[PDB]
Design a protein around this ligand. Structure first.
Ligand code: CL
Ligand code: CL
Ligand code: CL
Ligand code: CL
Ligand code: CL
Ligand code: CL
Ligand code: CL
Ligand code: CL
Ligand code: CL
Ligand code: CL
Ligand code: CL
Ligand code: CL
Ligand code: CL
Ligand code: CL
Ligand code: CL
Ligand code: CL
Ligand code: CL
Ligand code: CL
Ligand code: CL
Ligand code: CL
Ligand code: CL
Ligand code: CL
Ligand code: MG
Ligand code: MG
Ligand code: MG
Ligand code: MG
Ligand code: MG
Ligand code: MG
Ligand code: MG
Ligand code: MG
Ligand code: MG
Ligand code: MG
Ligand code: MG
Ligand code: MG
Ligand code: MG
Ligand code: MG
Ligand code: MG
Lengths: 173, 173, 172, 172, 173, 172
């Protein structure tokens, strides 16, 4: 039966918010995996590790804010398994940055589909919520990752171990 | 290809540490679920929600320290899916505390088996690591949860919603 | 069974109750020694201060074991605290020698407790003993040995000047 | 005879040794009560704090009498500290009632000691008891009576809510 | 005649502690040698020199703490000659780092054998002492040297004098 | 040839390597002396502190000579550091006398090194030795002589009181 607070909140939107919660936790897990890959003694790029650990905690905050939104609107949180990332070995600083760029575009596409649904269901509170707290965050994150990929490629990564070392010091440090 | 840092680190220990990483992340997920259950408008116990959120972040720190240990010893992190918690609806403040008690004793049993393995493989760095950073933390967490369950029961929970309200204010507040 | 109890053998629980009693007994011995040096015919105030501090430390040792018993779900059963074996501690040197003997006795009990914890595969308890008790005992025994050595080298107990000057310069 | 002893009857000296033992016994009762409320199946942390503080106070009462014994030239003879009469204090209310009974017993002992000091014309000792012990006992008994009254009015011991809220609001 | 403080301290443990004192002093001497090699005018890597001098002083602290332990337990210190290091010319920053890694694993192996002995003689004060003050310090030192070796190799050392110069500035500086 | 080397004889370079070893040996002697006074059957903490400070000073002496070797373009060749000639230093007085003998031996080696620098017309090296080593040795020898004198006048080594009081008042 209906939550006493629920108003103008479609059940499709409620379901889509539960899917987005899972996706944000999955992104947190990907970045956690990347972080400790750069902590391996045979990789040993500590500012890559720090950068991705920070990204990982950001994604957990993204998930928690969606959980708060679900309850604010009177929907009900249903959590699902968080799938392990698709790689165990992220190969290089460049490959991890390219993988993170791909991940952030995938998350952005999911947020755009969620906004389209909120628009279709005439839910301006939800569409404003997505715009305010997620859409520009995604644009900034994608732009930053693109910048990082560009610099690593221009410096000669991944073949140049010196390039990744110096990028670790000067851009992520 | 052995890690250049690896010394006196059995492959069974390495595997057991990967299992413990997953279990700590699972415990983080359980407490996250419990937290936002108390944030529901039809539950609305904000200090229960705060308490379990703090516990959830603690478990993530537990997991990250084990990931650090794996790399310190030259083992290799292999992550697995984080299973969703066994309940979506935690029923009451008392039931969530009893469920957390059961979870912490299960994690403690896993840590004790890990310590037995480290002892069997004559790995005093690993057994010291478990003792120092995990075993007394578990004893303290179990004792605190037991205290909380006792007080909730004595106050009349879960039937008395007044009892859970006052416990939220006076013990968790 | 206590809802918190896990991997805690009943023999360990009993041994912890015995150790609580022994720590309280050590607190009582040091209290007795303290006020012996407060007698007008002994009158070594820094010996008195030193043993009173030791007495309060032992009470802290006991209270931490009582906390541990409840942390693990065991149940505290207290027993009489026996009076110390002397009323008159004779001299500064004899009190220090007696305290050395006491601390080695307590250390032996802690080592037996650690052996029990190891035998029962209780690493939380063995870590607790190592962390909070074993090096504290080694430091206490080393300090008392040092004190006994200095008092003997200075000419105690026969030299009342030796005990006076040790009271001022080492315990002061 | 002690070079400081003056107007100090042998009966007073003995009575002071008995009172030292009783104050240590009261410290032990309150220590036992404190850790009872620290059990995971009792779990009233401000009851535990309150009785631990009371326990340390009683140890101070004992030490002050030991100092008095030496001040007057008497000689301290310690005896076993008996264990408390209960292991399980049942409830916050029952512990408070037990502490009230204990404090009135200690007060009766101090009144008998004052009567002895009066009978032996020892005004230093009677003033010592009046100054440092008698009003302390009256205040402690009054406070415990207040606590017992509130717990009973609130519905203890049957109401676990009553003991929980008293732990927070009065002892907290 | 027995020391008045001696209790539960086997003569084999006492001897093993004297051997470990010598090994810690030997490690201090190796790092001292390495330090001033990088101070040569034809090597001239001042932060390599600083790093190894700091390591050298740490090892002297390790030795002094074991001397204190020997007296704490009532054993008797017997010092032996401190052997000169196995090289006079440490060749390169990378070779010094690889040599320090080998040294620290050797010292770790000695400490693990010492812990085994303490365990065999049921000396939990000594096993706790080793675990507390030595074993994790060795794991951290080995992990750090492994990280350093990895970066130097990735950067192109020892052939690249630029690699060692930039590592001196950015990692050790 | 080193690009920095100028007016630096190979005999001087070798003599500097010998002096590095001797300073490290002096550091080892004082380290041994330090922990001798840390034994529970010796137990003179300020003797232990004093010799540990001296030990660290000698390590600084050695490191400054290693820096000098590189400054002048010579090459450091290290040798084994021989263990000290005693394991048991017997007493505070004997340790002080042994340290006096050591410092005069080190001074003689420095004077021979200065003579070599003078013979090879190396004023940078002779100024280095004068500036950083020769007056340091004169001060160290004077201080050790003073200490030996006081210990002897006080009655050491036979008076354990003498060494105890010197530990407190001069080294404390
Ligand atoms: Cl709706
Ligand atoms: Cl709908
Ligand atoms: Cl992979
Ligand atoms: Cl650069
Ligand atoms: Cl190995
Ligand atoms: Cl291995
Ligand atoms: Cl459910
Ligand atoms: Cl059990
Ligand atoms: Cl059992
Ligand atoms: Cl007696
Ligand atoms: Cl006497
Ligand atoms: Cl002697
Ligand atoms: Cl009289
Ligand atoms: Cl009972
Ligand atoms: Cl209230
Ligand atoms: Cl032994
Ligand atoms: Cl032996
Ligand atoms: Cl060589
Ligand atoms: Cl040699
Ligand atoms: Cl010798
Ligand atoms: Cl010897
Ligand atoms: Cl004096
Ligand atoms: Mg981000
Ligand atoms: Mg996100
Ligand atoms: Mg926790
Ligand atoms: Mg955990
Ligand atoms: Mg073993
Ligand atoms: Mg003590
Ligand atoms: Mg104790
Ligand atoms: Mg430990
Ligand atoms: Mg009171
Ligand atoms: Mg009293
Ligand atoms: Mg008056
Ligand atoms: Mg180091
Ligand atoms: Mg070392
Ligand atoms: Mg000097
Ligand atoms: Mg010198």
């Amino acid at each position: 039966s209906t939550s006493q607070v629920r108003q103008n909140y479609h059940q499709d939107s409620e379901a889509a918010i539960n899917r987005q919660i899972n996706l944000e936790l999955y992104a947190s897990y990907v970045y956690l995996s990347m972080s400790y890959y750069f902590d391996r003694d045979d990789v040993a790029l500590k500012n890559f590790a720090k950068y991705f650990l920070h990204q990982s905690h950001e994604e957990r905050e993204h998930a928690e804010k969606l959980m708060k939104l679900q309850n604010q609107r009177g929907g009900r949180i249903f959590l699902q398994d968080i799938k392990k990332p698709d790689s165990d070995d992220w190969e290089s600083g460049l490959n991890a940055m390219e993988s993170a760029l791909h991940l952030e575009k995938n998350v952005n596409q999911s947020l755009l589909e969620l906004h389209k649904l909120a628009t279709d269901k005439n839910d301006p509170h939800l569409s404003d919520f997505i715009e305010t707290h997620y859409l520009n965050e995604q644009v900034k994150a994608i732009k930053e990752l693109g910048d990082h990929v560009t610099n690593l490629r221009k410096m000669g990564a991944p073949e140049s171990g010196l390039a990744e070392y110096l990028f670790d010091k000067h851009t992520l440090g």
